[PDB]
């Protein structure tokens, strides 16, 4: 009835794992992409404060998803800012960009060593949960399966929540490269 039906949900897990170890690989790489092409280090001075063009289009709900994320792999964008509506509210576009950029920068969002640490750690936790899955289906249990299941679900959230932080992070590299050429407006 559910004797072989368990070995089912179980394999479904083993897949989920190898499949999650996959997004993470992307995220890790993608993130590195940005941490290696930011330029944002040239927009935190007094000489740039103004000369601010625009590009943080309508999709500025991306900022909501990003801060909503219950979890993440690298430090939650949630705790990087001072409030989830602090921007969705008062903060005016371009006036929020500088805000969002100041925080990301002052909170090491672009420190890749520490990003890699977090990223690697989760990659290991996944590999481990894989080996575990094997071990389980070789001495099944209902508790073991339940735990491993919740365990996997946690990394689900992390990896997904990570995506939000990256989209936001990429939306900023966009509104950043822009604001940069805008600086070179005179020269």
- Nearest 5°: phi and psi at 166? -80, -45
3-state secondary structure of 145: helix
Distances (CA, A) of 38 to 31, 101, 159: 11, 11, 22
Return d(Cα 137, Cα 105) in angstroms, integer: 46
The dihedral through the CA atoms of 90, 108, 41, 179 has a sign that is negative
What's the token pair of residue 108?
């090491």
The dihedral through the CA atoms of 152, 8, 11, 142 has a sign that is positive
The dihedral through the CA atoms of 43, 45, 49, 51 has a sign that is negative
User: What distance, in Å, lies between the first and last C-alpha atoms of the chain?
Assistant: 75
3-state secondary structure of 162: helix
103: alpha, beta or left, given left = phi > 0 and alpha = psi -120 to 50? Answer: alpha
Q: Do 46 and 75 meet the contact criterion of CB atoms below 8 Å apart? A: no
Return d(Cα 179, Cα 174) in angstroms, integer: 9
Burial (0-12, 13-18, 19+ Cβ within 10 Å), 41: exposed
| Residue owning tokens 């689900």 | 156
**Domain regions of the chain by residue span:** 1-187
Return d(Cα 94, Cα 171) in angstroms, integer: 13
Return d(Cα 10, Cα 4) in angstroms, integer: 10
CA 39 centroid distance within chain: 20
Which value in Å is the resolution of this experimental model?
Answer: 3.0
Return d(Cα 83, Cα 63) in angstroms, integer: 11
130: alpha, beta or left, given left = phi > 0 and alpha = psi -120 to 50? Answer: alpha
3-state secondary structure of 57: coil
Return d(Cα 170, Cα 104) in angstroms, integer: 12
Give, in words, the CATH class of 1-187: mainly alpha
Q: Of 169, 143, 146, whose CA–CA distance to 73 is shortest?
A: 169
Q: Return the number of other C-beta atoms located less than 10 Å from residue 49's C-beta.
A: 10
- Which DSSP state fits 107? T
What's the token pair of residue 50?
């103004």
- Which DSSP state fits 41? G
3-state secondary structure of 163: helix
What's the token pair of residue 90?
């008062």
- In order, the DSSP letters of 117-156 are HHHHHHHHHHHHHHHHHHHHTTS--HHHHHHHHHHHHHHH
């Amino acid at each position: 009835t559910e004797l072989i039906k368990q070995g089912e949900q179980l394999e479904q897990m083993a897949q989920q794992l190898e499949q999650l170890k996959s997004q993470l690989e992307t995220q890790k790489n993608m993130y590195e992409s940005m941490a290696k092409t930011t330029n944002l280090g040239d927009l935190l001075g007094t000489s740039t404060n103004t000369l601010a063009n625009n590009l943080p289009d309508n999709w500025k709900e991306v900022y909501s998803d990003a801060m909503n994320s219950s979890s993440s792999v690298t430090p939650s964008v949630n705790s990087m800012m001072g409030q989830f509506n602090a921007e969705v509210d008062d903060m005016t576009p371009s006036e929020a960009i500088a805000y969002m950029n100041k925080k990301l920068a002052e909170k090491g969002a672009y420190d890749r060593v520490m990003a890699e640490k977090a990223y690697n750690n989760q990659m290991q936790e996944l590999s481990d949960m894989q080996a575990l899955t094997e071990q389980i289906k070789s001495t099944p249990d209902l508790k073991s399966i339940a735990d491993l299941q919740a365990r996997i679900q946690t990394s689900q959230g992390a990896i997904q929540g990570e995506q939000a932080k990256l989209n936001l992070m990429n939306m900023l590299q966009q509104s950043q490269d822009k604001l940069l050429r805008a600086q070179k407006d005179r020269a």
